[PDB]
């Protein structure tokens, strides 16, 4: 064999991607500065144009001349490693380097491996104009909020940075009232190899740990430095007011994702979202409480998916119970028959958070132990009920010639549906 690496040091697939086109490196060309790009990108952006490294701008015209003559451009050692360990991706692989193709590849990459607690895509058939959704991290006063952002890609992307700004009002020392963001990755530390995913992850990290010494809003930075408790309080209050936060547990991001499944071209107002959140918290409390009592009455230390199933039948009207039971069972069987995945929800095929529901079931002191199937089942039931409610309310907004769901549409859809009225009458 030409060579081999220690198992520890075999590069991942993502570490084998071309920093310019975001496709797997094929015939990787490593420049004398030790920056690498795939040969098609080398041809389109170096050999045919500037004769400079796209990453560090070092001139490589002499190097190119020498190695083009000898057909020694390719880093054969790297090339062998990549072919041996990712042969299928190599085989599937001035066209390269084009901005439109790079943005499309990043979009696909988001579909296959979406970033933790984020999401982004084109707003309306213009690939250079995206909307992004971030959820407030749990280690931050923004927990439970849904922050929307805009992303404008420049025509020379990825060589110039994307333009990213919050559309959702937020109380942050590095984010101003227009939504502009002071973050190194967007300007001083931008690199063609960086992606929208890494930017969204860098923003989430900024929400967790602001930088008060380089602020866009000096008053907020001063408060963060002097009265951190006041900063956290105002941050939380703004999250509730503008980012669909909640005094209780928040499900807003998951409600929104479900809404985009059943009615993609339909929105929801913060007040209607607050109602959805009350529903989910009520269904959770009722099911979890009944499941607590079922385990206790039957001298069982553990709440499993069986107590959740029985609680569902006791609490929901007939047709809703049967469908909820079917969805909860489908999720548990899919989960147990699937490999461990990035999120437990993804393993279960759900939008609602299985890991969070499990934590809540144990934090609520409902029982000594909580089996792994219970949160899968419960989360699927909350998702099913959310999906049925939103489908009706969306249908009602369409009949009222409205593009956004409001509390009136929610109240209409629940009063007109007999079983939902019984369940959520209050
Ligand atoms: Cl190897
Ligand atoms: Cl040379
Ligand atoms: Cl492969
Ligand atoms: Cl293969
Ligand atoms: Cl998880
Ligand atoms: Cl999966
Ligand atoms: Cl279980
Ligand atoms: Na801006
Ligand atoms: Na029932
Ligand atoms: Na598990
Ligand atoms: Zn490339
Ligand atoms: Zn370089």
UniProtKB/Swiss-Prot annotation:
<protein>
    <recommendedName>
        <fullName>Ubiquitin-conjugating enzyme E2 D3</fullName>
        <ecNumber>2.3.2.23</ecNumber>
        <ecNumber>2.3.2.24</ecNumber>
    </recommendedName>
</protein>
<comment type="pathway">
    <text>Protein modification; protein ubiquitination.</text>
</comment>
<comment type="function">
    <text>Accepts ubiquitin from the E1 complex and catalyzes its covalent attachment to other proteins. In vitro catalyzes 'Lys-11'-, as well as 'Lys-48'-linked polyubiquitination. Cooperates with the E2 CDC34 and the SCF(FBXW11) E3 ligase complex for the polyubiquitination of NFKBIA leading to its subsequent proteasomal degradation. Acts as an initiator E2, priming the phosphorylated NFKBIA target at positions 'Lys-21' and/or 'Lys-22' with a monoubiquitin. Ubiquitin chain elongation is then performed by CDC34, building ubiquitin chains from the UBE2D3-primed NFKBIA-linked ubiquitin.</text>
</comment>
<dbReference type="GO" id="GO:0006513">
    <property type="term" value="P:protein monoubiquitination"/>
</dbReference>
<comment type="similarity">
    <text>Belongs to the ubiquitin-conjugating enzyme family.</text>
</comment>
<dbReference type="GO" id="GO:0036211">
    <property type="term" value="P:protein modification process"/>
</dbReference>
<keyword id="KW-0234">DNA repair</keyword>
<dbReference type="GO" id="GO:0061630">
    <property type="term" value="F:ubiquitin protein ligase activity"/>
</dbReference>
<keyword id="KW-0227">DNA damage</keyword>
<dbReference type="GO" id="GO:0016567">
    <property type="term" value="P:protein ubiquitination"/>
</dbReference>
<feature type="domain" description="UBC core">
    <location>
        <begin position="99"/>
        <end position="244"/>
    </location>
</feature>
<keyword id="KW-0053">Apoptosis</keyword>
<dbReference type="GO" id="GO:0061631">
    <property type="term" value="F:ubiquitin conjugating enzyme activity"/>
</dbReference>
<keyword id="KW-0808">Transferase</keyword>
<keyword id="KW-0833">Ubl conjugation pathway</keyword>
<dbReference type="GO" id="GO:0004842">
    <property type="term" value="F:ubiquitin-protein transferase activity"/>
</dbReference>
<keyword id="KW-0067">ATP-binding</keyword>
<dbReference type="InterPro" id="IPR023313">
    <property type="entry name" value="UBQ-conjugating_AS"/>
</dbReference>
<dbReference type="GO" id="GO:0000209">
    <property type="term" value="P:protein polyubiquitination"/>
</dbReference>
<keyword id="KW-0967">Endosome</keyword>
<dbReference type="GO" id="GO:0005829">
    <property type="term" value="C:cytosol"/>
</dbReference>
<feature type="active site" description="Glycyl thioester intermediate">
    <location>
        <position position="182"/>
    </location>
</feature>
<keyword id="KW-1015">Disulfide bond</keyword>
<keyword id="KW-0597">Phosphoprotein</keyword>
<dbReference type="GO" id="GO:0005634">
    <property type="term" value="C:nucleus"/>
</dbReference>
<dbReference type="GO" id="GO:0005886">
    <property type="term" value="C:plasma membrane"/>
</dbReference>
<dbReference type="Pfam" id="PF00179">
    <property type="entry name" value="UQ_con"/>
</dbReference>
<dbReference type="GO" id="GO:1903955">
    <property type="term" value="P:positive regulation of protein targeting to mitochondrion"/>
</dbReference>
<dbReference type="InterPro" id="IPR016135">
    <property type="entry name" value="UBQ-conjugating_enzyme/RWD"/>
</dbReference>
<keyword id="KW-0472">Membrane</keyword>
<dbReference type="GO" id="GO:0006915">
    <property type="term" value="P:apoptotic process"/>
</dbReference>
<dbReference type="GO" id="GO:0070936">
    <property type="term" value="P:protein K48-linked ubiquitination"/>
</dbReference>
<dbReference type="GO" id="GO:0005524">
    <property type="term" value="F:ATP binding"/>
</dbReference>
<keyword id="KW-1003">Cell membrane</keyword>
<dbReference type="GO" id="GO:0005654">
    <property type="term" value="C:nucleoplasm"/>
</dbReference>
<dbReference type="GO" id="GO:0051865">
    <property type="term" value="P:protein autoubiquitination"/>
</dbReference>
<dbReference type="GO" id="GO:0085020">
    <property type="term" value="P:protein K6-linked ubiquitination"/>
</dbReference>
<dbReference type="GO" id="GO:0070979">
    <property type="term" value="P:protein K11-linked ubiquitination"/>
</dbReference>
<dbReference type="GO" id="GO:0010008">
    <property type="term" value="C:endosome membrane"/>
</dbReference>
<feature type="disulfide bond">
    <location>
        <begin position="118"/>
        <end position="204"/>
    </location>
</feature>
<dbReference type="GO" id="GO:0070062">
    <property type="term" value="C:extracellular exosome"/>
</dbReference>
<dbReference type="GO" id="GO:0043161">
    <property type="term" value="P:proteasome-mediated ubiquitin-dependent protein catabolic process"/>
</dbReference>
């Amino acid at each position: 064999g030409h060579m081999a690496l220690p198992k520890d040091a075999i590069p991942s697939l993502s570490e084998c991607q071309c920093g310019i086109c975001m496709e797997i490196l094929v015939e990787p060309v490593t420049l004398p500065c030790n920056h690498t790009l795939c040969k098609p990108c080398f041809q389109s952006t170096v050999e045919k144009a500037s004769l400079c490294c796209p990453f560090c701008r070092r001139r490589v015209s002499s190097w190119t001349r020498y190695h083009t003559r000898r057909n020694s451009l390719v880093n054969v050692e790297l090339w062998t490693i990549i072919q041996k360990h990712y042969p299928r991706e190599c085989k599937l692989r001035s066209g390269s380097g084009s901005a439109l193709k790079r943005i499309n590849k990043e979009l696909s990459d988001l579909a296959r491996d979406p970033p933790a607690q984020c999401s982004a895509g084109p707003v309306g058939d213009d690939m250079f104009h995206w909307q992004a959704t971030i959820m407030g991290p749990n280690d931050s006063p923004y927990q439970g909020g849904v922050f929307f952002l805009t992303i404008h890609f420049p025509t020379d992307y990825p060589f110039k940075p994307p333009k990213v700004a919050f559309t959702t009002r937020i109380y942050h020392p590095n984010i101003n009232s227009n939504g502009s963001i002071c973050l190194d990755i967007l300007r001083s530390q931008w690199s063609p190899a960086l992606t929208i995913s890494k930017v969204l992850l860098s923003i989430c990290s900024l929400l967790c740990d602001p930088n008060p010494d380089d602020p866009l809003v000096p008053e907020i930075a001063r408060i963060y430095k002097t009265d951190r408790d006041k900063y956290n309080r105002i941050s939380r209050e703004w999250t509730q007011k503008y980012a669909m936060g909640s005094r209780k547990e928040s499900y807003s991001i998951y409600v929104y994702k479900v809404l985009k499944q059943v009615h993609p071209d339909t929105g929801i107002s913060s007040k209607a979202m607050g109602i959805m959140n009350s529903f989910v918290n009520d269904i959770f409390e009722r099911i979890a409480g009944e499941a607590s009592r079922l385990a206790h009455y039957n001298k069982r230390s553990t709440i499993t998916s069986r107590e959740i199933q029985t609680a569902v039948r006791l609490l929901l009207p007939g047709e809703l119970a049967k469908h909820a039971v079917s969805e909860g069972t489908k999720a548990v069987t899919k989960y147990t028959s699937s490999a461990k995945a990035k999120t437990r929800s993804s393993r279960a095929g759900l939008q609602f958070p299985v890991g969070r529901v499990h934590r809540l079931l144990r934090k609520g002191n409902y029982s000594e132990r909580v089996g792994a199937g219970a949160p899968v089942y419960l989360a699927a039931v909350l998702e099913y009920l959310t999906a049925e409610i939103l489908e009706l309310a969306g249908n009602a907004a369409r009949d009222n010639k409205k593009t956004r769901i409001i509390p009136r549409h929610l109240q209409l859809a629940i009063r007109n549906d007999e079983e939902l009225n019984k369940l959520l009458g209050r």
